[PDB]
UniProtKB/Swiss-Prot annotation:
Expressed at higher levels in primary colon tumors than in normal colon tissue. The expression level in metastatic colon tumors is comparable to the expression level in normal colon tissue. Its main location: membrane. Autophosphorylated. Phosphorylated by TYK2 on tyrosine residues in response to type-I interferon signaling, leading to its activation. Phosphorylated on tyrosine residues in response to interferon gamma signaling. Ubiquitinated by RNF125; leading to its degradation by the proteasome. It is found in: Endomembrane system. Interacts with IL31RA. Interacts with IFNGR1. Interacts with JAKMIP1. Interacts with SHB. Interacts (via N-terminus) with IL2RB and IL10RA (via its cytoplasmic domain). Interacts with FER. One of its GO terms (cellular component) is plasma membrane. Keywords: Acetylation, ATP-binding, Disease variant, Kinase, Magnesium, Membrane, Metal-binding, Nucleotide-binding, Phosphoprotein, Repeat, SH2 domain, Transferase, Tyrosine-protein kinase, Ubl conjugation. GO terms for molecular function: ATP binding; CCR5 chemokine receptor binding; growth hormone receptor binding; metal ion binding; non-membrane spanning protein tyrosine kinase activity; protein phosphatase binding; protein tyrosine kinase activity; ubiquitin protein ligase binding. The gene is JAK1. This is Tyrosine-protein kinase JAK1. It is linked to Autoinflammation, immune dysregulation, and eosinophilia: An autosomal dominant disorder characterized by immune dysregulation, severe atopic dermatitis, and chronic gastrointestinal inflammation. Additional features include asthma, food or environmental allergies, as well as poor overall growth with short stature. The protein kinase 1 domain is also called the pseudokinase domain and has a regulatory role through the transactivation of other JAK kinases associated with signaling receptors. The lineage of its organism: Eukaryota, Metazoa, Chordata, Craniata, Vertebrata. Belongs to the protein kinase superfamily. Tyr protein kinase family. JAK subfamily. Coiled coil: none annotated. The chain holds residues 564 to 850 of 1154 of the full protein.
């Protein structure tokens, strides 16, 4: 879009290791561990995404994703306070989102989630992705584990409010095995060649994420081997159609094997708003 030399703008001085306290381990991502933490100037609760000690290649890519999160500003995208270097550990320091990951939440509440709640989550995500598409940015790690609940909106007068977390290490530098592991969220062209990553990749992943929402955080292809996941895309399959025809139809449109045929998020938003009338 309009930032100039954004990685040159990343500050390795703004958040110093002496002011960051690491808290409990919360989860893992691709070569990463995620922790609770506290950032002292009065203090703020933060999330730390810590990259495994890696080659220069992987660290640079990790910082490029951090830089993109720093440049974007959208109410449905997690805020990144900055980065911290702690000897050989490279760390993204993000705001703490109190409700936690959406997958865990849906597992825990599968028996009280309603249709409008699910629809609101989908619409908020489309809105974040529309914003990224407008800026020619790709995320590449859209899934419910990477959606954080700022407001639960179960028994509240207000509905849910989600925030999309950072992408972690860009697909650009992942191994073929790591790309296969990410099936069926990863766009199939990126499995063929990680160089195929493009804005269209996030449409495919948004489809898989709608599948997860429809199925209350169930993991699609859970326990399938890498060889079976490979087979899945080689045979041009899609996960089973949800009951909810409105979300199933968006899912099908988005999970087209031709990236060029996946509709724009602009159009998905127009359609979602139309459904609301």
């Amino acid at each position: 879009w309009q930032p100039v030399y954004p990685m040159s703008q990343l500050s390795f001085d703004r958040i110093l290791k002496k002011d960051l306290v690491q808290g409990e381990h919360l989860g893992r991502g691709t070569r990463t561990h995620i922790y609770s933490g506290t950032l002292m100037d009065k203090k703020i609760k933060v999330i730390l995404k810590v990259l495994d000690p890696s080659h220069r290649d992987i660290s640079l890519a990790f910082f490029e994703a951090a830089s993109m999160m720093r440049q974007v500003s959208h109410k449905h995208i997690v805020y990144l306070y900055g980065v911290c270097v702690r000897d050989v550990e490279n760390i993204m320091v993000e705001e703490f989102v109190e409700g936690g990951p959406l997958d865990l939440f849906m597992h825990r509440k599968s028996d009280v989630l309603t249709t409008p709640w699910k629809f609101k989550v989908a619409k908020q995500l489309a809105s974040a992705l529309s914003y990224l598409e407008d800026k020619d940015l790709v995320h590449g790690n859209v899934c419910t584990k990477n959606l954080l609940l700022a407001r639960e909106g179960i028994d509240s007068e207000c509905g849910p409010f989600i925030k999309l977390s950072d992408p972690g290490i860009p697909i650009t530098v992942l191994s073929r095995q790591e790309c296969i592991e990410r099936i069926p969220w990863i766009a199939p062209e990126c499995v063929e060649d990680s160089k195929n990553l493009s804005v269209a990749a996030d449409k495919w992943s948004f489809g898989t994420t709608l599948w997860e929402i429809c199925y209350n955080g169930e993991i699609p292809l859970k326990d399938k081997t890498l060889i079976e996941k490979e087979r899945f895309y080689e045979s041009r399959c899609r996960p089973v159609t949800p009951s909810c025809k409105e979300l199933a139809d968006l899912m099908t449109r988005c999970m087209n094997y031709d990236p060029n045929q996946r509709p724009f998020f602009r159009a998905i938003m127009r359609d979602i708003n139309k459904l609301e009338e």
